């Protein structure tokens, strides 16, 4: 069960980092 959780949470982490990346780009573009 632990490995499934780890997979799931890393998916969430990748998701949020993409959001942060897109927000940085948006901020830089004015």
């Amino acid at each position: 069960g632990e490995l499934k959780c780890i997979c799931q949470e890393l998916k969430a982490i990748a998701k949020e980092l993409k959001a942060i990346a897109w927000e940085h780009k948006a901020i830089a573009q004015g």
Copy 2:
């Protein structure tokens, strides 16, 4: 119990990153 710990900490990490993401949403 290491794998359980790893799962738990990653949950926390995901939570904090969401908080950071929603902050960036603000201020464009």
Copy 3:
């Protein structure tokens, strides 16, 4: 020994990200 280290370092990582999150909120609040 490796898995213990991994657990320990992820604890540290979660800690620092919470710090960063709180600092962002503080910055946004003026």
Copy 4:
């Protein structure tokens, strides 16, 4: 398939962090 998933997601994470890093390069 959990280990494969973990590998794949870490790839994505590395990719996004590089994007963030290059943004910071801009604006000094």
Copy 5:
């Protein structure tokens, strides 16, 4: 030696995040 590598890299990651955190402390 993969698990050792993972441990080592996570140590580095924690270190860099602490640096980033203390930067944010500055500038409020």
Copy 6:
């Protein structure tokens, strides 16, 4: 093969976070 990938990607992640850290410091220094 999966563990090798995980090791490799974490190396990349550590690398980018160091870059981000250095950029923050540079920004703070004016």
